[PDB]
């Protein structure tokens, strides 16, 4: 769920509020996304987007009525490091996997303050 995202990214950036520094930015941060990214972090969202697309395509996914942003897994944070739990059935597992690999890529490429809020005229 959103929430745990969150968390994520939390345990590889420690000095960041996600929600309030990768929430619309670029063309692909936040609900939504289409056009060519405008940077390497804004690819991560785009790569996150299709994790979820796919996930929603799996047949564990289709008999839930939550969606990625409503479905909660379990996970830990240890030393920074992530952990997705094996207790995670396989629609949750799968999504977290997507913010697992999402909140890794964040923490490994710039961040360009220009890009925050983002005109979607842009994409
Ligand atoms: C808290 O950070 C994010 C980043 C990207 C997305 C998304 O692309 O839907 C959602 C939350
Ligand atoms: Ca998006
Ligand atoms: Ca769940
Ligand atoms: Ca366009
Ligand atoms: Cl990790």
């Known amino acids: 769920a959103l929430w745990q995202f969150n968390g994520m990214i ?18 692909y941060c936040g609900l939504g996304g289409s056009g060519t990214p405008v940077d390497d972090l804004d690819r991560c969202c785009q790569t996150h987007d299709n994790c979820y697309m796919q996930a929603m395509k799996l047949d564990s996914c289709k008999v839930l009525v939550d969606n990625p942003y409503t479905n ?18 396989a629609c949750e ?31």
């Open 10 to 27: 939390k345990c590889k950036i420690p000095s960041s509020e996600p929600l309030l520094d990768f929430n619309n930015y670029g063309c």
């Open 72 to 89: 909660n897994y379990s996970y830990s944070c240890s030393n920074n490091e992530i952990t997705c739990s094996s207790e995670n059935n």
């Open 93 to 123: 597992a799968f999504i977290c996997n997507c913010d697992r690999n999402a909140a890794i890529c964040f923490s490994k490429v710039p961040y360009n303050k220009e890009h925050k809020n983002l005109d979607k005229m842009n994409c």
